[PDB]
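thread from #wetlab-drylab

HS: before we spend reagent money on co-crystallization trials with zinc ion, can we at least see a predicted complex? here's what I'd submit
DV: go for it
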Amino acid sequence: VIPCKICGDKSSGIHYGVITCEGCKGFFRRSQQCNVAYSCTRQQNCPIDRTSRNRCQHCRLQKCLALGMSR
Amino acid sequence: VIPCKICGDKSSGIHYGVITCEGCKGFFRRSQQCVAYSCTRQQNCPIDRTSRNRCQHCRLQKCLALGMSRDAVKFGRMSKKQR
DNA sequence: CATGACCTACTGACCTAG
DNA sequence: CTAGGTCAGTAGGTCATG
Ligand SMILES: [Zn+2]
Ligand SMILES: [Zn+2]
Ligand SMILES: [Zn+2]
Ligand SMILES: [Zn+2]
């Protein structure tokens, strides 16, 4: 009904300040527990949709942080 | 327990959207990384466990024909609505 | 060289404590 | 209602072998 702000999949609620799906919510929580560092093999700006969200963890985390997800 | 849709070997899960063995899974990924594959026959070779490496064109051909694609990837367990 | 068995490093549907 | 935890799940790296 309401799409995830990060990837556009079916959202499940407001998680860490942003309407996200369960995948982006779990992905972001795991990134903030270890203080992750990802690197983009491409142009530092890869489209984050439902099927591409796992192809760059750097740009997925970047989308989460830019739209205000915080713990 | 489910035979590989490409070659009939024991599959190890759903890879790029298709139930495949470890061999066809790694073969498809390498084919997309790169790519040239030519068939010395009529582009119709049977793909089974013993013959899967004899013609790479017909192996990748079968991979794509069954829908193997980086867009068909799905992680996690399967949903209640899929049982 | 390419192949594929094996292992790592994750992914996300589902549930409960709060 | 939503963190957080669980565990059934997979991409992809390795490298001895084909
Ligand atoms: Zn999402
Ligand atoms: Zn990227
Ligand atoms: Zn196979
Ligand atoms: Zn052939």
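DV: The longest helix of chain B spans residues 22-33.
HS: ok that's useful, forwarding to the group
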